[PDB]
Every structure is written in structure tokens, then in C-alpha cells.
Amino acid sequence: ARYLGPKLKLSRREGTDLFLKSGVRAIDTKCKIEQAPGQHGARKPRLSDYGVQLREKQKVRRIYGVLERQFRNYYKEAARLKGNTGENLLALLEGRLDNVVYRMGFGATRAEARQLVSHKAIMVNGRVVNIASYQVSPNDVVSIREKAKKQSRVKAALELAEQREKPTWLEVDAGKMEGTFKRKPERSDLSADINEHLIVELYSK
Amino acid sequence: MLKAGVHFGHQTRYWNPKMKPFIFGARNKVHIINLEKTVPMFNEALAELNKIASRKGKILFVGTKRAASEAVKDAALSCDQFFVNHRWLGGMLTNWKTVRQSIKRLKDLETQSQDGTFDKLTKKEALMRTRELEKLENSLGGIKDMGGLPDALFVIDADHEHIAIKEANNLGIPVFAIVDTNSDPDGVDFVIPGNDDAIRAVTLYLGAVAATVREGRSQDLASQAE
Amino acid sequence: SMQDPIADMLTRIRNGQAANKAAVTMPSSKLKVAIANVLKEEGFIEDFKVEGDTKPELELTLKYFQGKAVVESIQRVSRPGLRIYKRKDELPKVMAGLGIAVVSTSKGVMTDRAARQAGLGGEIICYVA
Amino acid sequence: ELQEKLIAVNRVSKTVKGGRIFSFTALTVVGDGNGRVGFGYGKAREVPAAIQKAMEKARRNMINVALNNGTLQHPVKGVHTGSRVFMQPASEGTGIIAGGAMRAVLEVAGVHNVLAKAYGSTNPINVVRATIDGLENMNSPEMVAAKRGKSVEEILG
Amino acid sequence: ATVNQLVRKPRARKVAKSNVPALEACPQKRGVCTRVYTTTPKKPNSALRKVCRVRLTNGFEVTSYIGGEGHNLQEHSVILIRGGRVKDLPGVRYHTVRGALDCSGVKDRKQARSKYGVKRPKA
RNA sequence: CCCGCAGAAGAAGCACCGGCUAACUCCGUGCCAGCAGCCGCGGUAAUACGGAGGGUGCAAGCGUUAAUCGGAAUUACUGGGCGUAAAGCGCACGCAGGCGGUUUGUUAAGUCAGAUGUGAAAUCCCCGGGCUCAACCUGGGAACUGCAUCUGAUACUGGCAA
Questions:
Q1: Is D89 an interface residue toward C (CB < 8 Å)?
Q2: What is the CATH number of the domain that holds A67?
Q3: Which molecular-function annotations from GO does this UniProt entry contain (chain B)?
Q4: Domain interval for residue A19
Q5: Among chain C residues 42-81, those with CB within 7 Å of any atom of strand F
Q6: Using CB atoms, which chains have 3+ pairs under 8 A with E?
Q7: Which residues lie across from A170 on neighbouring strands?
Q8: For chain E, which domains are there?
Q9: Which of A178, C22, C81, E50 has an alpha carbon 20 to 30 Å from D151's alpha carbon atom?
């Protein structure tokens, strides 16, 4: 399933930072981002019209941690669902449980927050959920069970997430370690750096 | 990151209060410019330079500062761009209609004095026409090959060349400057809060701009076409 | 040998709009004056005049707003070789609704937008865009 | 402000007494993103000179096209030299889903979402002249209202 | 054209012909492989292409190319046959699936070893 | 299904990297060995063969083969053509077939509108619910592009009369 390799070579192929590490320091200047993704890294390519679409899709999939079969099911769900298709697709990717745990700040990265969700530690609506692909409905409460509560890492990662842009579609308490998923985010609410029509057009091909 | 040059902060007490977003009062009664906010603005500047220089546009580099004098000529003739570093003439851009024939005097006079009548009249006439060439040469030498109105203005001190900024805000040229703490970030479109008076800094900022220009002018698209 | 006088009317309207003529004339009939009446109600054509007693001829003043003509395109849909009848909720909209389709229904010859609020359909005669 | 785009470069020959002497042709479309498009063909002995000819030829050849909310006003055909083009407004079709050499001129025109299908031949020069003929062919409800019906509430309804 | 002519005679569907007449609607077939030999290809290429004749299990006796670099097939050699022509020899329309029954794998392969039937060099 | 124990411990391959098509260098070989879906590579400096490094895609799968549709407007009803590209009978008459000027009246067959019955359930689609989520199951609807009958409309088409 999940990737589990060198998780900053991906960000050097994309060029742009993917926030795949915690961000204690900055982008370290100890990876040489923006100049080389491999051996022929200084050789900058042409990156044609199929290439910009492909690197857009690989960009969003490598941000969120979703594979191609599941991601294509997310496109299909975004296409049957009413309204703007790329907005529905980013709403579905912002509705994954591990992303909601990340954007509460209960894990530093997506893989870490995925490990808290995977190791029966994250509780939603007073119920345990083990699965990183849970779609969180609006007006839900996401919590942390008493076992993995106050174990070094909600403390560390929640201490670190104080500088991370404060996503305003969810309430968070951080002493009770809970958060209400208030409403789904509009396209205007996430960073304007990913380019959705390239992806929707790519699967439209 | 203070990467290689030291661009930490400035003067003491006569800060322009418009730059309240970039201050940290140090123990020596000296301001510290917010270096963790400088870098997003500098990257927002270079992302404009790649666009308007990949337009095949003309950047005009401005800084005198008595210390950043040679860093502009050295760090700007490495590109295909144009510079003003010795004296900023009042109206080189908005009165360029009459700066034009002074450029014609410079080009049309070194044309006469490289081979022509540079000895044919008087030793005193060589002492006049040559002194004219060394007076116009470090006054119009970098702008000599321009022959038009520039598309951008890279100012190294807003407080020192504030009339170049207002100059290229009478007309529609997007200026951007690295400002000091006492400078005024009003006419400047893409403000860069940093060090104006360090030789390391006017190597660093101007060097990275010099990389975005010549690295920005497509050497890749052209190659593909070929 | 003149088996569709309605198409023979529309080709005179189209050839007049091409040839930049002030008026056109065809041998009149009840259906031609009905369809031309619909076109004057819409505003593609001003001033049809039926002028005759035994062998009637109806003329049309052809509109020209700019130097460009007004009838931008005009097709013939229910030709005699292949008649086309539509339901209520299957009536087309020509040029995304800013052209008009002439349909003949049981309440008379009218436009598609007239037949939607009329709540019925029929034989779509032509597409005037 | 201009947002140029190169479509395709072709390598042509002339065949003189000595040998076949090659040159390059470009094909560009430029345009702001409010319904202005110019294509420039351009040809030179070397590739970047050819694309530069195509830029300067494209900039003085623009066509005003009226579009609302980044899409067409009505489905419109188009024809130029055996390249038939059908393109469709697709009100939030969500993707400028056109073929090669039509996607370029459309997204530098400023439409963001069409349903464009290219019939006939698919030569890039003829399909870009066909889509610029279709985009100039398309008119607006104020255009058809100002020449017919005399009300946009009557023309649209 | 002419809808009335289309009513009198309907518009006839084009008829697709299969490229692999050895048994149709079957991904693989199995043969006896009499006369393994070599054939020079057609004109612009020049090599010795190793090709065996094959009498299948349905009565067809087709000819088929042997891929990889060196093989071990001699005249009784029951082998498995998949589709795909070569565009280099006249009439060779099939391939022998390497590493399947007797048409064993290729030695010292490391890349693309699903094709040619070579197992993973562990130890 | 839940609770506890143990320790990162038991768990990553497959295809590709000349263009189409995302991803490049060296070495081995020398129109050989081989590759190939189509163009086509291989004659000593092969980004195309074989190996290594590096990269790209997919992932408990990956690739090849077979088969259907698409792309194919490449059988064109939607939606093509026929001077020279494939294609106008050598030219007519002419039965069946198709199509038919214009006005009035009648009919209501075609056509249109409504209603009723039927078009099984499952399946597709919409709004929900339950399985920790999903796949899956399921409530209600929509739809089932139709057929028959009754009631009307009579602009067009047809039947009849003038």
C-alpha cells in the first residue's frame, strides 16, 4: 500500500516542498531541494504537456499519501458528486481521517498521523476508528484515546503544529485533545498551490 | 537563513514606522529584520524576475551606496542587463526623451575618439573631449546599450535612491528594492526587507537576482526548438 | 420538382441574406405566412407583405443590423424525406437557447420557448439561429 | 499579461542543387485570458528565431472573443481546410478537455472548461485556424439581443 | 447517404479478421514442436532468427519464434505458444512462452525476467 | 469484537526508461547476439541488444497473451463521401417503392397532451441507513427510453369530398 521509501526525494522530484517531514527546522538545506531529484538532477528536462499533468497528480498523491486505485476512486466519487469536480476531489482528500488528525496537529507528518490512526489511538464521535481512509462527516468530534494520550508525540507534534497556518474549518482544544470538523473546506481554503484542473483533465483523458 | 552574507538588521532609532512588520529590538539598541519573513518576499521577487526577464524584458539595476558601486557593474554585466551605479541623474527615465541625445553624445563621441579626431585638433581638445567621455562614461555607461524604457528597476537602497523610485512611479515601471530599516516601502512593489550597506549583502541579493535573470532567460525552450 | 416549398422559402431567406438583398419574394401559402409571421414575432425578419389575389406572392424585408446579416444560420429539420416530431420535454434549444426553433403544434405554429410554456410539442419545422 | 504558448515545431526542406537545406517553422498562440487570441506561424533557419517570429506575428494578429465566466456562450462548430471542430460550452465541465493544438489556443484564450472534439484532419495549423474561426464565430446574448428581439430577457427568456 | 436506401439495404458492418488463427479465443496453445531451425529475416534486417515449427493440439501446424538468447528445444519438446507476430520473418505469428513446459528460461538474465521465465537470483 | 503481553521484531516486488510515453549514463558486444506494439535499432563512442548504477509508473501485485468496445466521423441515424484521391449505371422509358403545388370543409390514422393499466424483483442513478471505513447489504424514490385503452388538440402529414 503506502510508499515508505526516502520521503524527500519525492519532494525533490516535485521541486516544491511537500511538508513530508515534521518541520522542526526549515527545509533543512541538507537535502538539496530544487536542484536534483537523482543522478541526472542538474539536467533540467522539458517536462511536456503530459508531464505537467502527471507531475500535478503525483504531487497531490504524494502530499496526501493515496495510491492510484484509491485516488482514482476519489476522482470517480468527485465526478458523481454534485458541483465543481476538483473542489469535490480536494474536499474528499481533506476529509480523510489521517489528514484531519494532521490538521488538528496530533501528528507531525501524514505518515505519523497515519500511524496514530492505524494504531487504534484516534477516536471519532466517541468511537475507535482504525482506518486512515475514514471520511469525517461535518460536525464530528475527533479525539485521542486514553492509552496513547500524553505520550510524547501528541505533545511534541502539537507543540510543533502551532506555527502551521491554523486551518479554519475545524475547532481544536489541545488540552482535551479534541476537534470538531465544522465544515468541508472550499478550494479557497487550501493554499492555491496545487492545480486541480490538470488532475481532473488527466483522468478526463 | 543568513545563508552566506550577513543581512541581520539595522540602524538604531530612526526607523521608518511603516516597517513595524520587520523589527526586533536588540540589546545594542539596533533593529533586527525578520529574516524568517525576508525569504518569502525575496522568492516572491525572483518569481517575478523570471517572468519579466523571460518576457525578454530589461532590468535596470540601481545602487550607489559608495560600497555597492562595483557590485552592481560586476554583478550585472554578468547578465545581459543594464546598470546605474555612480550618479543617478534626475530624470533618466521620465525625461529620457532628453537623456537620449546625451547617450547619442556618448556613443557618437567614443565613436569619434576611439579612431577618429582624438588627436587631430589640440592636446587641450583631447583633454576636453576625453574628460567629457570620462564624465559621461560613469554616468550613462550602463544605460548606454538600453535604447528604451526599462521594464523593471532593482533598487538597492530606497532611502538613498528614493527619487529613482518616484521617477519610475510617475510612469508605469514595477520597481522593487531591498529596503533598509529606515527606508520607506511605499513606491516599492516587491519589498525586500534586508541589508543595504553590506558588501556581503549586495553580493548576495544582487547575485541571486543575477542568477534568476541569466538562468531565467530560456536556454531550455530555445534549445528544444532548435 | 418543388416538393418542399418550406425549404424553398428558407433557401430564399438564406440566399437573400448572402446576396445582401433588401427584400425577397416567394409564392405564398398559409404555412409560409404562418412561419414568416413567427419570424417577424421573433425579430429575424421585418415586414412580410402578402400581395396578390389569385396567385399570391409574399415578400419579406430582410434585416441587416451591422454590415453583417441578421439570420446567422437557418436549417431545415422536418424535410419531407424524413419528418421529425418531438415531445414536450424533448424540444431542442437552438444555439443554446439564443436561437429559435420553429415547431408546428396543435395550437398553431410557434417557437420552442412558446411551446414549453404551452406545454406541448409537435413537428419541429426549422432551426433559425 | 501576455502568456504565450508554443504548440508545435516542424522541420521543412527546400531541396536545392547542393543538398536539402532545412529550416524550421513554429506555431504559437498568445493571449491575455479575456478572450483575445492571436496565432503566429513564423519560419526561420533556426528554432528560437522561428518561435520569435511567431511571437511577433502572433501579437499583432489578435481576435476579440466574448466569453462569460471562462466558457463559451453556445456550442459552436468551425471549419478550416479539412479540419472540422466542434466545441461545446460545458458549464463547469471542469477541465479544458480539448485535443492537441486546440487545448493551447483555448486555455490562452481564457476558457477554462469546454467539451471540444476535433473531427476531420488534425493538422495543428489548420485546427488552430479552425478554432480561432469558431471562437470568432461565437457571439454573445448582447450581440444577438442588439440585433434581434431587443431584450436579453426576451432573447434568453 | 439516403435514409430510404438505408431502409432498403441497411448499412453493413465491417468484418474483423483475427491475426491468430491457431485456436481462436485462447490465450495459449500447446504444441509438439517438430523441426526447430533457423531462418534469415526479410531484407533490411539480417540475423539468424531461431524459429520452430509446431504441430498444436488441434491439428494446426503453425511456425513460431523462440525468444531470448539460446534455447534447449529438440524436436519433441512440448512447448506452450502465445500470440504476437514478429514483423521480421514471413508468417511467424506466434511466440513460445519461455520457462513454461520444456522451453526453459534464459541464462544470466536480470532485467525483464517475467518475460523469458527467469527466477530471481537470491543466492 | 474487546482487553492484556512481547519486541521494529514476521511482511516488496513487477514492468519500463529512442518517439508516441513519465523516466539517462557507463560498460560488454559489433548488421553478430538480439530487440520490436508502429516507425524501426544493431557495420566500434548503441540514451532502442545484454549487464550495472540512477530514475519513472503501478503495487500484493506487476507484466505478456487472448477477447469486446472505445479512440474509428474507419459503415457516418446522431455523423462521411462520389470532376481528378475508392466511388454517378453508357443513355433512356418505366411497374412496385419513395416524395409531392394551392384553397376550403370533414376525419383524427400518423402527430401532440393528459389519465389508467402494465413495463417482475435484482441491476444502473438520486437521497438516506447499517457493517470501525470502503467493497458489500438495504429503505424510499426516480427510471424502466415502451405497449395497449379512454379522453381531448387539429398547425403539419395522410385518408375522403369539392
A1: yes
A2: 1.10.1050.10
A3: structural constituent of ribosome; zinc ion binding
A4: 7-93+190-203
A5: 78, 80-81
A6: C
A7: A181
A8: 1-123 (2.40.50.140)
A9: C22
